[PDB]
Design a protein around this motif. Structure first.
Motif, PDB file in Angstrom:
ATOM      1  N   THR A   1       7.477  21.523  51.999  1.00  0.00           N
ATOM      2  CA  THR A   1       8.128  22.457  51.079  1.00  0.00           C
ATOM      3  C   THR A   1       7.487  22.491  49.709  1.00  0.00           C
ATOM      4  O   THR A   1       7.884  23.285  48.853  1.00  0.00           O
ATOM      5  CB  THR A   1       9.605  22.068  50.907  1.00  0.00           C
ATOM      6  OG1 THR A   1       9.695  20.681  50.584  1.00  0.00           O
ATOM      7  CG2 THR A   1      10.368  22.329  52.230  1.00  0.00           C
TER       8      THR A   1
ATOM      9  N   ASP B   1       9.443  14.323  60.955  1.00  0.00           N
ATOM     10  CA  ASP B   1       9.386  13.737  59.621  1.00  0.00           C
ATOM     11  C   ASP B   1       8.019  14.068  58.987  1.00  0.00           C
ATOM     12  O   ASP B   1       7.188  13.184  58.760  1.00  0.00           O
ATOM     13  CB  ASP B   1       9.629  12.222  59.718  1.00  0.00           C
ATOM     14  CG  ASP B   1       9.484  11.493  58.378  1.00  0.00           C
ATOM     15  OD1 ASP B   1       9.800  12.086  57.321  1.00  0.00           O
ATOM     16  OD2 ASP B   1       9.053  10.312  58.393  1.00  0.00           O
TER      17      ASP B   1
ATOM     18  N   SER C   1      16.221   5.703  53.813  1.00  0.00           N
ATOM     19  CA  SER C   1      16.225   7.099  53.445  1.00  0.00           C
ATOM     20  C   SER C   1      14.996   7.387  52.570  1.00  0.00           C
ATOM     21  O   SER C   1      14.649   6.603  51.673  1.00  0.00           O
ATOM     22  CB  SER C   1      17.528   7.431  52.727  1.00  0.00           C
ATOM     23  OG  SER C   1      17.525   8.781  52.263  1.00  0.00           O
ATOM     24  N   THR C   2      14.320   8.492  52.880  1.00  0.00           N
ATOM     25  CA  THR C   2      13.100   8.919  52.158  1.00  0.00           C
ATOM     26  C   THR C   2      13.407   9.898  51.014  1.00  0.00           C
ATOM     27  O   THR C   2      12.500  10.444  50.405  1.00  0.00           O
ATOM     28  CB  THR C   2      12.063   9.544  53.123  1.00  0.00           C
ATOM     29  OG1 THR C   2      12.653  10.651  53.812  1.00  0.00           O
ATOM     30  CG2 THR C   2      11.579   8.506  54.124  1.00  0.00           C
ATOM     31  N   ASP C   3      14.679  10.121  50.709  1.00  0.00           N
ATOM     32  CA  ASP C   3      15.030  11.121  49.679  1.00  0.00           C
ATOM     33  C   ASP C   3      14.686  10.788  48.224  1.00  0.00           C
ATOM     34  O   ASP C   3      14.691  11.678  47.363  1.00  0.00           O
ATOM     35  CB  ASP C   3      16.521  11.414  49.765  1.00  0.00           C
ATOM     36  CG  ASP C   3      17.375  10.231  49.282  1.00  0.00           C
ATOM     37  OD1 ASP C   3      17.634   9.224  49.969  1.00  0.00           O
ATOM     38  OD2 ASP C   3      17.757  10.298  48.140  1.00  0.00           O
ATOM     39  N   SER C   4      14.416   9.524  47.933  1.00  0.00           N
ATOM     40  CA  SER C   4      14.049   9.128  46.582  1.00  0.00           C
ATOM     41  C   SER C   4      12.543   8.848  46.415  1.00  0.00           C
ATOM     42  O   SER C   4      12.049   8.739  45.298  1.00  0.00           O
ATOM     43  CB  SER C   4      14.848   7.919  46.184  1.00  0.00           C
ATOM     44  OG  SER C   4      16.052   8.283  45.536  1.00  0.00           O
TER      45      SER C   4
ATOM     46  N   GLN D   1       5.510  11.512  47.702  1.00  0.00           N
ATOM     47  CA  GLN D   1       5.070  12.154  48.940  1.00  0.00           C
ATOM     48  C   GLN D   1       4.894  13.645  48.796  1.00  0.00           C
ATOM     49  O   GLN D   1       5.452  14.270  47.896  1.00  0.00           O
ATOM     50  CB  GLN D   1       6.038  11.815  50.098  1.00  0.00           C
ATOM     51  CG  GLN D   1       7.473  12.234  49.879  1.00  0.00           C
ATOM     52  CD  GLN D   1       8.459  11.709  50.934  1.00  0.00           C
ATOM     53  OE1 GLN D   1       8.079  11.109  51.944  1.00  0.00           O
ATOM     54  NE2 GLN D   1       9.742  11.949  50.688  1.00  0.00           N
TER      55      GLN D   1
ATOM     56  N   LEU E   1       5.669  16.858  50.804  1.00  0.00           N
ATOM     57  CA  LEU E   1       6.429  17.441  51.892  1.00  0.00           C
ATOM     58  C   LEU E   1       5.934  18.861  52.160  1.00  0.00           C
ATOM     59  O   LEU E   1       5.344  19.487  51.284  1.00  0.00           O
ATOM     60  CB  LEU E   1       7.920  17.457  51.519  1.00  0.00           C
ATOM     61  CG  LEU E   1       8.526  16.101  51.147  1.00  0.00           C
ATOM     62  CD1 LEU E   1       9.877  16.301  50.443  1.00  0.00           C
ATOM     63  CD2 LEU E   1       8.622  15.231  52.399  1.00  0.00           C
TER      64      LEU E   1
END
Lengths: 170, 170
Positions: free
Chosen positions: A119, A73, B166-169, A115, A117
């Motif tokens: 990418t 992660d 979930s960390t997607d947002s 955050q 990341l």
């Protein structure tokens, strides 16, 4: 204060004490250095008319912190984005020509609302100098933001850094 | 919420996702991990009666950050002591049995008023849980201090960490 932009090589020189001279402000060397370049620095303008810095860190998946933070992660530690801001405020004080070693003194409020990341392509720092005080100790107060690929993700209000000469201590 | 102290091996297990399980809170691995042991953790007591953590980091001159921060002037980065506090608050939320990945959300005031030199022996962290909220997102608010060999040197008020299923947002 003649120069308004700095390359990575200039910043590495600064980390060796070779930009501002021994006993004066030093950036950390890698791997604590969180800045690749300073694209703008000035003692006028900014949100408070007392100066500003714009700086950048290029992101790639091999940056050291991604492997350990966290396993499975990867995400840039907020504390390091925050440290980049202290690094820049310290750099500002040295750049003005003040003597002494830099120490971060703290912050008023810090917020992490996004955050970085692996990418991502590029982190940008925007620092607004709010006040410089020259009473017993030289210090700077600033606000800052961290953005990733155009999007604001961290903010700090009341960042404080002081310079400590040989006669002053912590 | 049954075990009240953790060894370094337990913390390393936590950094691999093997203490709280996959998708749940993770400490960073070295070199971002800023805790050697948790000597006390509880969901009662502390300054607000809502829990507390006491943890330690052993200091020696070979810790990686001393060489780069700064050359000729070794001192522990304040940002890493601050991060230890976010690491501990995150650990607290996982330890309570909440699901999801940890993200530091920020802090109210942060103060650095001393330093950790390579001649120090031990850093101690004291964290007081102020509030845990379970409404939309699970989060903790806490105050913390960092001390070195008995002497308080950093403080943070209103440390905030959230858990994300979930960390997607973010």
């Amino acid at each position: 204060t003649k120069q308004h932009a700095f390359t990575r090589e200039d910043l590495l020189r600064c980390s060796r004490g070779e930009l501002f001279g021994p006993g004066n402000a030093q950036l950390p060397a890698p791997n604590m250095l969180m800045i690749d370049r300073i694209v703008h620095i000035s003692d006028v303008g900014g949100k408070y008319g007392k100066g500003e810095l714009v700086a950048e860190l290029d992101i790639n998946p091999d940056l050291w912190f991604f492997a350990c933070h966290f396993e499975g992660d990867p995400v840039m530690p907020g504390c390091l984005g925050l440290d980049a801001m202290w690094q820049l405020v310290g750099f500002y004080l040295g750049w003005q020509g003040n003597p002494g070693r830099g120490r971060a003194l703290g912050s008023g409020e810090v917020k992490f609302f996004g955050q970085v990341l692996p990418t991502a392509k590029k982190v940008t720092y925007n620092i607004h100098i709010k006040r410089t005080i020259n009473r017993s100790l030289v210090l700077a107060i600033a606000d800052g933001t961290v953005s990733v690929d155009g999007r604001e993700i961290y903010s700090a209000e009341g960042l404080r850094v002081g310079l400590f000469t040989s006669t002053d201590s912590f």
